[PDB]
Amino acid sequence: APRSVDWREKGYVTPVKNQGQCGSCWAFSATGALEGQMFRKTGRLISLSEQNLVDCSGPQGNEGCNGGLMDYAFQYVQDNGGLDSEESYPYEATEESCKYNPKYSVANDAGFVDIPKQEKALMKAVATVGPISVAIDAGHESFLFYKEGIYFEPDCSSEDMDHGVLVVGYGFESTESDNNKYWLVKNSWGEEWGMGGYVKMAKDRRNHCGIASAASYPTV
C-alpha cells in the first residue's frame, strides 16, 4: 500500500460539519463515507443530509440523537432508495419525524462492506476505496483538547467505542517517540476543534481507540 493517502486532495471530502449537542456522529460518519463513494462514481461532490438519517433510519436500528451505526445508515439508504442532500434537508441537531422527499435524493447505495478488524485491512481499504467510516473511543478529555500532532491516549479502549468518525487518509510525521504513523480523521465537532476539525490518530499502535474495530463503507 502507499505510505501516505489523503482523499481530500482527490476531491472526495466535504468540509467539516458540526453535530452540535446531538448524539448523531454515526450519521456524519455515514454521510462522509457515502459522499466519498458517490464522488468516486459520478465525479460530483454533494453534501448529504445527516438529518435525513437521524429522522428516518430508526427501522434499520438507529436511535437518532441517542446513537446509531454507520452500517444501519447504509442499509437505510439502500432500503429507502435514496438520501436527500444537505441543502434540501438541513441539519437541526434534534430528532423529528421523517421528511424524506425522493425528488431531492442525490445518493444511493447497494449495501456496505465491513472491513476485517485489523489496521492492516483498514489501511488497504483506505488506500483503494476512499474515506472509510470508523468508530473510536473518544471519551477522554485529551481528545476534547486535541490541537495538533499525533493523538495517543494510554487509557483508550480498543473494544468500547462511542463515536463515529471518518478516515480520509493516513500518513506519517517524525515524533519524539518514533511512533510516527497516523490515520487522518475527519470529526464532526466543527472546524474549531482539533486541526481544522481533523485529528491525526495513532496508527499501528495496537488498534488505538478501536479505530479498526468497526470500519465499513457503502457500496456504490
Numbering used by the authors: 1 to 220
The publication says:
Here, we have further investigated a potential dual-targeting effect of Calpeptin and, indeed, show the pico-molar inhibition of cathepsins by Calpeptin, its sulfonated prodrug analog S-Calpeptin, and the chemically similar prodrug GC-376. Binding of the activated compounds to Mpro, CatL, CatK, and CatV was characterized by X-ray crystallography and their antiviral activity against SARS-CoV-2 was confirmed in cellular infection assays.
Residues involved in the catalytic mechanism are highlighted in stick representation. c Surface representation of the empty active site of CatL with the catalytic cysteine highlighted in yellow.
